[PDB]
Structures are given as C-alpha cells and as structure tokens.
Design a protein around this ligand. Structure first.
Ligand SMILES: CCCCCCCCCCCCCCCCCC(=O)OC[C@H](CO[C@@H]1O[C@H](CO)[C@H](O)[C@H](O)[C@H]1O)OC(=O)CCCCCCCCCCCCCCCCC
Ligand SMILES: CC(C)CCC[C@@H](C)[C@H]1CC[C@H]2[C@@H]3CC=C4C[C@@H](OC(=O)CCC(=O)O)CC[C@]4(C)[C@H]3CC[C@]12C
Lengths: 10, 32, 35, 406, 390
C-alpha cells in the first residue's frame, strides 16, 4: 500500500 | 493507499493472461 | 504546386514498409479538394 | 513599374520563407498555451478516472451476470507497467527507474502504430541485450546475473559490470536506444539517444545520467542539431526556450557549464548539470520528460526531403543531413569515460566492436524496415460504433414504436 | 526562352517577320505560376449575376438566330448562306463550351455546385464530350505544360528523332503513317486536328485507367454524350435526312472544332518557345509565363467567345472567374510586360503555322518545314549509307 518509487513531487 | 493496492492487483491479473495467450500463440503458430 | 513532390514521396516510401494512368492524379485531387 | 529579372527570385524567397514560418508556428501553437501539460499528463489521466467500456459484448456481459469492464488511457497504462520486465531491475536506483519508465512510456504511447523492434541479428544474437563482465562468452545462457555471486574486494573480477539494452525502430526514427549500466563500486549510468532516419531533417535527441552512490553526479540533455551550422529550426528553439522558462526557472543559471567535447555538437540550449539538492534534480527531471515528449509530438507530423532529378538544393540537404549525423557519431566515440569503464572490464577488441556496431553505428546504405499497423485503429473503432445487419432495424423500430405509446 | 539577351531591333524584326507584336525576353528559373496570383487585386474574384447571365445568354441568342434563319430557308438557299449560318452557330457553341469548361474547373457558380455540374454536363454533351474526363485531361495538361514526351493532351509537336525512327522502320517515305502525317500537318486540315483530340478522349472506353473509387462518376460522364448521340442524332436525321443532317449538325460541328484547334495551337506554339524534356531544364513558371502566346481578336468575336483567348491569367490564378479575365490581363501586362508574347489573328499567322513550322528539332530547338527537313535527313540517310560502306 506504499509507493517506494521516486517521483519529483516528493 | 487503495491506489497502490489496485495497481499491484491489476498488474498481476493482466500479466497472467498476457503470458498465457503469448505462449498459446507461439506454440500453435510458430513452433511449426 | 505540391503534385510534383508528392509524386516523389510515394516512390520514396516505395522502400520502407516490411493502365492506372490517372490513379495518382485522381487520388491527389480528391485529397486536396474535398477537405 | 515593370519587374526585373532578379526580384522574381526575391519574391520566391519571401514566399517560401513565409510558408516555412507559418508551418513552424503552427507546430508550437499546441504547447504554447499550457506547457505544464507536457509533464502533468499522467496526473490528469489518473484524475479523470477509469473509463467504462461500451461495446456490445461487454454490455451484454455486464447485463447478464454483473461484470463491468473498465479501461484506462495509455498514460495510466504505461504508469502501471513501470520498469516493466527489465531483467536488471531490483538493482536500479529509483531515479533511473522513474526516467526509464517515462521515456519508454512515451515511446510506446505516441509511436505505437509503427514502433517495431530492431532486427534481431544485429544486436540480440551476439548477446548484447544483457552483458556481464564475469561471463563474457555466455556459457550460462544469460542467467549470469543470477548464477554468479558478486566478487569480493581484491578477487579476480572486482568490480563487476552489467549492461542492458533495448533498441527499437520506427517510421521516422531509424533507432531509439536505451541502455542502463551498473558497476559494483556503486556507479550507475543511463544513456538514451534517438536518431531520425537519414531522410528527415530533425535534430538528434540525447540524454545522459551518471550517478554515484545515490547522488547524481552528472546530467546532460539536449537536441543536438544536425545542420552544418549548429542551428535548429525556429520551433525547436522556441519550444526549448518555453520549457526552460517553465520548469528550470528559479534554479542555477551559472551551473550550466558546457563540456569541452560538446562545444562542437551541442546546441546553444543544451543542459549540463551537477545538481545541488532535491529541488534542482526535480526541476531537471520534469524538464527532461517534458522535452522528450514535446520532441516526439513534433515529430508526429514530419515529412522527408526527396531529391528530384535536376534539383540541387535537396541533394545538398541530404548530404548535410548525412554529414551531421556522422559528425555526431564520430564525436561521441571519443567520450572516453564510458569507453574506459567498458574497456577496463570487458577488454578492448570487444569494446571496439560493441561501440562501433551498436552505440554509434552509422552506415547510410542500411536503415531497418518497419511495420505500419494503422489498420488496427479501424477495428477498435468499429467495436464501439458497430453496425447491426438489417434485421435489428426492424426489431428496434418495433421496440421504439411500442415503447413510445407512453 | 529561345531568343535570349539581344537588342530590341532583332526582337522586333523577328516579331513583324513572324506576325507577333511583342516578342518575349527571358524569365528567371526556379519559380511557379501560382506566385503571381498575389499581383492581382482581390476585387477580381467577386461573383456577380449580371456577367453570368450575359455570358450564358449571348451565345444562346446567336445560336437561336442562326437556327431560326436556317430553318426559315431550309434547303432553298445557296451554299454561301449555309456556310454563314454554320459559322455563326459554331461560334455561338464555342462560347457555350467555354462556359462549360468554366463549370468543369469549378469556378463558374461555386455556391450551387450541383447546378453548375448539371449545367456543364448539358452544355458539353452536344459536342460529344465528357465532363469528368475533360477535367482530368485539362488538369494533367496544366501540370505538364510544354514538357517533352509528357504533354500528350496538348499540341505535342512531331519531333525529328521519332520521324527518323519511323522512316528507318518504313524503309522509305511512302508508308501509310508517312502519308498520314504528310497530309495532316502540311494542309489546312491541320486547323481541324482537334478532332483527333476528340477521339483520344474515351480512353478506349476502358475503366482500367482510372481510380476505382470514381467508376460510377466516370461512367455517368460517358452516358451523357452517348444518350445525346442515341436520342437526338436519330431525330435530326429522321426529320431531315442526310442533307438535313450535314447542314444542321455536321457543319457547326466542324466550325466549333476549327475554333478549338486554332485557339490551342496558337496558344502554345511559336518558333521562340522551346520544348524542354524533363530533367533537362524544364521549368514550370518559365513554361507557363514565357511559353504562352495571347491571341487578340475583334471585341465582337471576344464577347461571342466569352473571352476564350485569354488563357494566361487563369493559369496563374486558377480560381479567377471568366468575366475578370480581360481586366486581369491588363494588370499582368504591366508587371510581366517584357516577358509576354502577343499576336493578332491574321492570315499570315495561319499561313506560317501551316507552311513553315511543321517539325520540331531539338538540337537547333526550333521549328522547320517538313519537306526540307525530311530531304535533309534523307540526304544524311544516304551519307550514313555511304558511311555503311564497311
Ligand atoms: C472553345 C474554347 C473552349 C475553351 C477551352 C479551351 C481549352 C483549350 C484546350 C483544348 C485542347 C485542344 C488540343 C487540340 C489537340 O490536342 O489537337 C492536336 C492533336 C495533335 O496532338 C498530338 O497529336 C499526335 C497524333 O497522335 C499525338 O497524339 C500527340 O500525343 C498529340 O499531342 O491533334 C491530333 O491528334 C492530330 C491527329 C489527328 C488527325 C486529325 C484528324 C483530321 C480529321 C479531319 C476532320 C474532318 C475535316 C473536314
Ligand atoms: C455515329 C455517330 C452519328 C454518333 C457518334 C458516335 C460516337 C459516340 C462513337 C463513334 C466513334 C467512336 C470511337 C471510335 C474509336 C474509339 C477507339 C476504340 O478503342 C480502341 O480502339 C482501343 C485501342 C485499340 O483497339 O488498339 C473504342 C473507343 C473510341 C474512342 C470510340 C468511342 C465512341 C465513338 C466516339
């Protein structure tokens, strides 16, 4: 249920 | 929250049938 | 004015993917007129 | 009052100039109004939600049992896939993951009707789709990334080098190439390049990221010009300027140094950066994604230049295009960084062959074919606006005429 | 152009020697006729009903007058009265045919396209011509003007080389094709060679030359001539017999074909207008501006023909309507002055066309009489036979 990815909006 | 859970579920469901039909087509129409 | 170059672009595209004297003229005309 | 044998040529020049200007302006008119939509397309597609499918089969199904079929736009699909099936994921820093996912997503979403895979005998049978330094002969059949553990310090092998490539052909581009490399000492590179066919007058797109221990040490993106004077068309310069004003504003203007080797191939708006913190990196990432997408969308409507018998201007243009692409290739070959990180691990006779045939090959007498599958758009169309055959018309007029009595 | 840089004296002596008024200088290469459409005032393109009804009604009145007279005195009149009524009817119909040619290029009444299509079909049928095929052949002509080996829908000249080839195949100058060319381009019957054009339409009655998506439109085009020649040419004969046919249909027909042929032949042929092959210096604007000759007629004839001689203006502005063609020319003559060629219809011109300019040789790039040319190339035949000694 979590992101774990890097996206330029934090 | 629900977004990521749905992403995982849908990815799994789609990749299942994609691979199933890819192997079907290969074996029937290309091994020959 | 563009007929001459489109007559060339077809014989260019003749290479890539992998009677009938008024065919090309009529095709070009119908494309350019009824838009 | 009468005209001269010369000012006729002045009239010809002015006419073709106004024509070129008009078409170049028409190209930018789309991005001009809202540039933010070049990066925020995924968020908007997510916002609008999952579309419901209305085709006779799905309607009959969801009416019989219960099952509603849902769809998703292409941006959301390529966001769900992500770094889909790369065999060297799980080892890639999240920034490189994000960038690869976005770039390959734009390729698969914009060029989807003509995107093919590069011929397999040119790269994939030599074993260049997955290269490992601890197994330069492929006696483990390409599972060396899983069978052989990492060599410890001082052992024969430190540091190990792994590479993975993907090469595509298309209708406008003779090569779209994305390659990732990892080394055991903590180095990761990402290198993307896009070459238009030898008959199109477009700049070459290029991007490089080099990160060391999770910190981006170098990042460079640019549309390298292909003409002999290092001058883009008007609309490329306009788009680059608009995007830099949109995304990079408020960041360093003095860090954009120009490398010594790029000074002969770089456009006046190339971007070279050693980022400071998180905000610089976020700005650069947004800008790179937006620039790539704008480039592809402007390529969507390109026309080749053809050499007519008697015409010398088009022969000159074709020669200039060939020479520009060749100049880029030969000036990229002496970027000694990647060359040495390869050759000190894989040898030299291997490195020269690999860099000559795959990374920067240039042979104008061979460009790969492609497969135009646009007819597919017909089928999809006719499954959502179908037609029923002359006997459903009677039944439907009966249904209407008998339902309309209320 | 053929007469390049040279003073006005030789230009004018050539002019009055050949019957032209103003010969032409030299136009720069690398251009297109559609350029000079910017030199035209925008008011020239306006539609008005006055000129429309006048242009459709004047030739109709001339035709009706000729027919009323001719029937009032059916066969009691001598041959000269018959000739004069036939000439009048032929000219009236050439006017109505110019109107039909305007409707074929979609520039007569653009607001009502169905009406202008029906009108063009109706006015073209009595000459046994097809409207869609006419549109196609004329467009193909505009795209290939003066192109050697390609402008087959215009007065392509008989070149020296093909004549030599035919003479080598015939084994002498007595064959059938030889005598055919001999009488067709040496006698005044040349002024009717347009009838050959008429037979080359109906491209074999062969639907395999066209694009399939157009079959129904082409077939319909062929059915309007046929219906005429199937429903009206019987009646005429049945109601007047052979004579009542040769005086009511065949003579106006021959006059109309005279007009067509002379107009076109004078338009695009002159000793100073070269015929460059493709790739060998053929230029579009140079051939459409410098390679055109404007014929001047008396104003009664012009108003009877609906300004059918003014062809240069509607080659640079293909949407320019018919009644604005004279005025527009006056504009272009001011700016393109030194390059244009002009002529007045006189006996000397036609005598020169018949007796002097018969064969086109590309080495000298000019026209030369048929007989001297054939005897010269036959003397060179004798000399190559002497060269064939061993
Ligand atoms: C009216 C005004 C209407 C407004 C429209 C004006 C538009 C002008 C376009 C018209 C184009 C006309 C072109 C004329 C033309 O092609 O003809 C000129 C063409 C000559 O043209 C060349 O002819 C050669 C002959 O094969 C080849 O066909 C060449 O391809 C062809 O270009 O005429 C011929 O075909 C001559 C040979 C036919 C023999 C003539 C038969 C004579 C029969 C005698 C008739 C009875 C006499 C009593
Ligand atoms: C008989 C009179 C009173 C009415 C007018 C009749 C026309 C409508 C006919 C008679 C002459 C015919 C033409 C005579 C010659 C030909 C060529 C012929 O085709 C070929 O000869 C093809 C090439 C070949 O055979 O080698 C058929 C079409 C066409 C144009 C014919 C089309 C119909 C035409 C014009």
């Amino acid at each position: 249920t979590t992101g774990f990815g890097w996206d330029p909006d934090g | 929250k629900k977004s990521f859970k749905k992403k995982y579920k849908d990815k799994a469901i789609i990749y299942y049938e994609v691979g199933k039909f890819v192997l079907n087509y290969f074996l029937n129409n290309q091994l020959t | 004015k563009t007929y001459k170059f489109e007559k060339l672009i077809t014989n260019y595209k003749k290479m890539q993917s992998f009677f009938g004297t008024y065919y090309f003229l009529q095709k070009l005309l119908s494309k350019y007129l009824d838009v | 009052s009468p005209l001269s044998p010369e000012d006729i040529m002045r009239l010809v020049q002015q006419h073709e100039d106004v024509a070129a200007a008009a078409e170049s302006e028409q190209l930018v008119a789309q991005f001009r109004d809202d540039p933010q939509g070049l990066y925020e397309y995924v968020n908007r597609a997510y916002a609008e939600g999952p579309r419901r499918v209305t085709t006779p089969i799905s309607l009959l199904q969801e009416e019989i049992t219960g099952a509603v079929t849902e769809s998703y736009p292409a941006a959301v699909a390529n966001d769900i896939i992500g770094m889909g099936s790369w065999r060297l994921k799980d080892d890639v820093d999240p920034v490189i993951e994000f960038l690869v996912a976005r770039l390959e997503g734009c390729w698969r979403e914009i060029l989807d009707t003509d995107l093919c895979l590069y011929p397999r005998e040119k790269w994939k049978e030599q074993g260049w789709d997955l290269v490992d330094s601890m197994d330069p002969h492929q006696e483990l059949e390409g599972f060396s990334y899983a069978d052989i553990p990492d060599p410890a310090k001082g052992e024969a092998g430190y540091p190990r080098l792994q590479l993975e490539n993907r090469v595509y052909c298309s209708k406008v581009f003779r090569k779209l190439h994305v390659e990732v490399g990892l080394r055991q000492d903590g180095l990761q590179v990402l290198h993307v390049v896009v070459y238009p066919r030898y008959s199109y007058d477009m700049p070459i797109f290029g991007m490089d990221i080099v990160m060391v221990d999770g910190r981006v040490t170098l990042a460079v993106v640019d549309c390298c010009p292909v003409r002999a004077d290092l001058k883009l068309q008007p609309h490329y310069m306009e788009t680059m300027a608009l995007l830099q004003r949109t995304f990079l504003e408020g960041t360093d203007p003095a860090l954009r140094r120009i490398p010594e080797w790029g000074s002969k191939i770089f456009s006046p708006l190339a971007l070279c950066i050693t980022p400071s913190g998180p905000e610089e990196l976020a700005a650069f990432a947004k800008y790179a994604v937006a620039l790539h997408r704008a480039y592809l969308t402007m390529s969507l409507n390109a026309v080749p230049v053809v050499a007519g018998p008697g015409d010398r201007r088009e022969a000159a243009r074709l020669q200039e295009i060939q020479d520009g692409q060749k100049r880029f290739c030969d000036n990229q070959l002496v970027n000694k960084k990647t060359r040495r990180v390869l050759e000190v691990a894989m040898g030299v006779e291997w490195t020269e062959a690999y860099m000559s045939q795959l990374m920067f090959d240039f042979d104008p007498k061979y460009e790969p074919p492609y497969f135009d599958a646009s007819f597919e758009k017909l089928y999809t169309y006719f499954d959502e606006n179908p037609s029923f055959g002359e006997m459903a018309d009677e039944a439907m007029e009966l249904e209407r005429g008998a339902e309309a009595e209320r | 152009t053929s007469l390049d840089g040279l003073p006005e004296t030789q230009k004018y002596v050539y002019a009055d020697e050949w019957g032209f008024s103003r010969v032409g200088a030299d136009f720069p290469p690398g251009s297109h006729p559609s350029l000079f459409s910017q030199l035209l005032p925008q008011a020239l393109f306006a539609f008005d009903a006055r000129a429309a009804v006048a242009a459709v009604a004047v030739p109709l009145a001339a035709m009706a007058a000729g027919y009323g007279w001719l029937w009032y005195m059916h066969s009691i009149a001598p041959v000269w009265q018959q000739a004069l009524c036939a000439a009048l009817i032929g000219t009236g119909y050439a006017g109505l045919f110019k109107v039909a040619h305007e409707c074929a290029m979609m520039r007569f009444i653009p607001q009502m396209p169905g009406l202008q299509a029906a009108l063009g079909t109706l006015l073209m049928a009595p000459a046994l011509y097809s409207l869609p095929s006419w549109r196609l052949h004329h467009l193909h002509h505009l795209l290939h003007t003066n192109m050697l080996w390609q402008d087959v829908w215009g007065w392509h000249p008989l070149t020296k080389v093909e004549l030599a080839d035919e003479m080598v195949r015939s084994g002498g100058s007595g064959g059938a094709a030889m005598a055919a060319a001999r009488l067709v381009l040496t006698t005044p019957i040349k002024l009717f060679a347009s009838v050959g054009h008429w037979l080359r339409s109906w491209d074999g009655l062969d639907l395999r030359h066209f694009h399939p998506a157009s079959y129904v439109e082409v077939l319909s085009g062929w059915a309007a001539p046929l219906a005429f020649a199937g429903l009206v040419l019987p009646a005429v004969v049945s109601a007047g017999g052979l004579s009542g046919f040769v005086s009511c249909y065949l003579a106006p027909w021959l006059v109309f074909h005279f007009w067509l042929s002379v107009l076109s032949l004078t338009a695009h042929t002159a000793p100073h207008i070269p015929w460059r092959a493709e790739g060998d210096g053929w230029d579009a604007g140079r051939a459409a501006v410098a390679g055109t000759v404007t014929l001047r007629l008396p104003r009664p004839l012009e108003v009877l023909l609906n300004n059918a001689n003014y062809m240069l203006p509607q080659a640079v502005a293909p949407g320019l309507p018919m009644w604005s063609a004279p005025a527009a020319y006056a504009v272009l003559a001011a700016r393109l002055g030194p390059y244009l060629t002009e002529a007045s219809m006189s006996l000397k011109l036609l005598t020169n066309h018949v007796t002097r300019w018969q064969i086109y040789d590309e080495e000298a790039h000019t026209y030369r009489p048929m007989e001297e040319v054939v005897d010269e190339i036959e003397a060179d035949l004798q000399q190559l036979a002497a060269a064939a000694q061993q």
